[PDB]
Paper text:
The interaction of the central mitotic checkpoint component [name] with the mitotic kinetochore protein Blinkin is required for the kinetochore localization and function of [name] in the mitotic spindle assembly checkpoint, the regulatory mechanism of the cell cycle that ensures the even distribution of chromosomes during the transition from metaphase to anaphase. Sequence comparison of [name] and BUBR1 shows that these proteins share a common architecture: a conserved N-terminal region, a central nonconserved region that contains the binding region for other mitotic checkpoint components such as BUB3, and a C-terminal serine/threonine kinase domain. The N-terminal region mediates the binding of Hs-[name] to the mitotic kinetochore protein Blinkin (a protein also commonly referred to as AF15q14); the interaction is essential for the kinetochore localization of this protein and its function in cell cycle arrest induced by SAC activation (Kiyomitsu et al., 2007). The structure shows that a divergent triple tandem arrangement of the TPR motif constitutes a suitable structural framework for the physical linkage of [name] to interacting partners.
The crystal structure of the N-terminal region of Sc-[name](29-230) from budding yeast was solved at 1.74 Å resolution, and contains two molecules of [name] in the asymmetric unit, related by a noncrystallographic two-fold axis, forming a homodimer. The two protomers are associated primarily by hydrogen bonds and van der Waals interactions and involve clusters of conserved residues E52-P57, M98-K109, and R175-R182. Salt bridges between the oxygen atom of residue D53 of one protomer and the nitrogen atoms (NH1, NH2) of R179 and R182 of the other, as well as between D55 of one protomer and K109, R175, and R179 of the other, contribute further to the stability of the homodimer. The structure of the Sc-[name](29-230) protomer consists of ten α helices (H1–H10) that contribute three major features: a single α helix (H1), a tandem repeat of three units of the tetratricopeptide (TPR) motif (H2-H7), and a C-terminal region encompassing three α helices (H8-H10). Each TPR unit (TPR1, TPR2, and TPR3, numbered from the N terminal) comprises two antiparallel α helices, arranged as a helix-turn-helix hairpin. The uniform arrangement of neighboring α helices gives rise to the formation of a right-handed superhelical structure with a continuous concave surface on one side and a contrasting convex surface on the other. The amphipathic helix 8, which encompasses residues Y177 to M194, has the features of a “capping helix. Helices H9 and H10 lie parallel to the long axis of the TPR core, establishing extensive polar contacts with TPR helices H3, H4, H5, H6, and H7. The analysis of the crystal structure of Sc-[name](29-230) strongly suggests that the impaired interaction between these Hs-[name] mutants and Blinkin is due to the disruption of stabilizing interactions among α helices of the TPR units.
Residue numbers in the entry: 31 to 199, 204 to 229
The structure:
């Protein structure tokens, strides 16, 4: 009874993606509605199908919306990228970093504090300690919003740096610059396009 209703809802959303997206003012909203439904209702009943459908839907969303310049600094869009990285790329630093680099190259999220906070966190966890600091400072120099929160994120990070006895001896900036040079789209994007 529940499973059947859930399956009809899945097909209803899939049809809407085919029929309705093209004419929408806010096509991102339809993807968001569907992803929220999958991650709550659908995955609670069928975790293995739900995982696959969530991953595919998120990839479709990113691919469909990515070349629409109007969405470049939409915080809702940014969050989908970061959810994707966290859910699906967490065991893969290179693909995670490549995703952030691809976004950076396309100007996705580059005016939003969250982008720099999350990208810095990735580098921090990977022990690129001073590159992670420079990335936060880069966000501030690009006038990213919310600005004050970014400044507090940087302050808290400097506190973590002191707890590990870390200071410079500008190579960290040049090291970050080297890390930021765009090379290739992440594999999940390339695989989607070729499939």
């Amino acid at each position: 009874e529940q499973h059947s209703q859930l399956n009809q809802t899945k097909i209803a959303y899939e049809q809407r993606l085919l029929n309705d997206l093209e004419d929408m003012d806010d096509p991102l909203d339809l993807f968001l509605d569907y992803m929220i439904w999958i991650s709550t209702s659908y995955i609670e009943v069928d975790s293995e199908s739900g995982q696959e459908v969530l991953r595919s839907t998120m990839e479709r969303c990113l691919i469909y919306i990515q070349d629409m310049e109007t969405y470049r600094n939409d915080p809702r869009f940014l969050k989908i990228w970061i959810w994707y990285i966290n859910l699906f790329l967490s065991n893969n630093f290179h693909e995670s970093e490549n995703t952030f680099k691809y976004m950076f190259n396309k100007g996705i999220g580059t005016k939003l504090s969250l982008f720099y906070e999350e990208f810095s966190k990735l580098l921090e966890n990977a022990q690129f300690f001073l590159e992670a600091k420079v990335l936060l400072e880069l966000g501030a120099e690009n006038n990213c919003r919310p600005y004050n929160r970014l400044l507090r994120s940087l302050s808290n990070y400097e506190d973590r740096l002191r707890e590990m006895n870390i200071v410079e001896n500008p190579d960290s900036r040049e090291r970050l610059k080297g890390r930021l040079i765009y090379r290739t789209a992440p594999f999940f994007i390339r695989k989607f396009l070729t499939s």
